[PDB]
Design a protein around this ligand. Structure first.
Ligand SMILES: COc1cc(OC)c2c(=O)[nH]c(-c3cc(C)c(OCCO)c(C)c3)nc2c1
Length: 110
């Protein structure tokens, strides 16, 4: 599972790469609810998550296994699906980035 954590890190790097930037960018940094006018965001979302936070946790060796890492990535998408009207542009972007994630996560080495 050092090997599994390296697969996870590879996924993370891909998610942050220019390849996916057109739909990944809203996930780069924590949602700035204040800035955006989303004054209910932190009443609705108990545990914010974003790719910069996942990167910091990987860098700090916070994740002890692939499943812990995946839980944070899925939390980030679930927060998006919870908060937003399902026709919002950001939800379309979340679906696309999550397709990238789930297909490559599935290729995890034993
Ligand atoms: C700039 O990055 C983001 C990332 C986001 O999530 C990962 C979101 C997100 O979850 N919702 C919204 C968002 C923004 C506005 C101004 C909204 O009001 C529409 C008018 O009623 C709504 C419903 C959602 N913007 C994000 C921006």
């Amino acid at each position: 599972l050092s090997e599994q954590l390296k697969h996870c890190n590879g996924i993370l790097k891909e998610l942050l790469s220019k390849k996916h930037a057109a739909y990944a960018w809203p996930f780069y940094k924590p949602v700035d609810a204040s800035a955006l006018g989303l004054h209910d965001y932190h009443d609705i979302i108990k545990h914010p998550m974003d790719l910069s936070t996942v990167k910091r946790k990987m860098e700090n060796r916070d994740y002890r296994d692939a499943q812990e890492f995946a839980a944070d990535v899925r939390l980030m998408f679930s927060n998006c699906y919870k908060y937003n009207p399902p026709d919002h542009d950001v939800v379309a972007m979340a679906r696309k980035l999550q397709d990238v994630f789930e297909f490559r996560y599935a290729k995890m080495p034993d």
